[PDB]
Amino acid sequence: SMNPPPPETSNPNKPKRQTNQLQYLLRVVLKTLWKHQFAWPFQQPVDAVKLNLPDYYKIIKTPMDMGTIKKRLENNYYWNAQECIQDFNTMFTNCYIYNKPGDDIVLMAEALEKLFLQKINELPT
């Protein structure tokens, strides 16, 4: 029922890059999803205490959220675009795992994921 430490956003010994694809992931992908009307549940780690979801972190063992992704991008945490794309997909998958089809939160994730897919379809070479 308690919250775990959040995913790390800083690790000085992890090697880092600022590739054109990573810049696109921040300036296009993250920015588009972050401003969406349905972004709010995904803008920070799930607070299982405040939301009264005592089983959330029993089921979700690789938590991820756009607040974490935003900090990772702004902090140049990643080596490549695939790492960041994986974080987005982990976020969506966690939502679908924990919740039920048709739940409001699932419809919200689906809308954000549709935009995600549209933007990553134009990921620059």
Side-chain angles (χ1 to χ4, degrees), residues 1-17 19-26 28-30 32-36 38-57 59-70 72-81 83-99 101-125:
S1 64
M2 296 166 44
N3 288 320
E8 65 171 32
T9 57
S10 173
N11 186 336
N13 279 337
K14 181 180 187 299
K16 314 299 202 319
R17 292 191 304 180
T19 69
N20 64 315
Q21 296 184 331
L22 281 162
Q23 293 168 0
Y24 179 92
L25 277 158
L26 175 57
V28 175
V29 181
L30 187 277
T32 292
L33 273 60
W34 188 268
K35 71 187 187 186
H36 194 277
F38 294 161
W40 60 271
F42 305 96
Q43 287 174 327
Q44 60 286 308
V46 171
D47 185 338
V49 178
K50 286 302 192 183
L51 297 171
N52 191 22
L53 308 173
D55 64 342
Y56 185 85
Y57 291 109
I59 295 167
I60 298 305
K61 299 301 190 187
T62 311
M64 188 52 56
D65 66 279
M66 297 200 294
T68 297
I69 295 168
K70 184 172 183 292
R72 287 179 172 192
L73 287 166
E74 292 171 344
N75 292 349
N76 302 306
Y77 177 83
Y78 297 114
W79 185 261
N80 67 34
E83 286 179 88
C84 179
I85 291 168
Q86 177 63 70
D87 285 345
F88 278 102
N89 281 319
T90 295
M91 180 183 77
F92 296 129
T93 298
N94 289 344
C95 186
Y96 304 146
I97 290 173
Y98 184 75
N99 297 285
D103 285 346
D104 280 339
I105 189 65
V106 170
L107 298 175
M108 295 167 91
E110 286 176 349
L112 299 173
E113 187 181 19
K114 178 179 179 178
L115 288 168
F116 174 75
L117 288 164
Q118 292 173 324
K119 302 307 185 187
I120 69 170
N121 181 58
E122 306 199 37
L123 188 72
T125 51

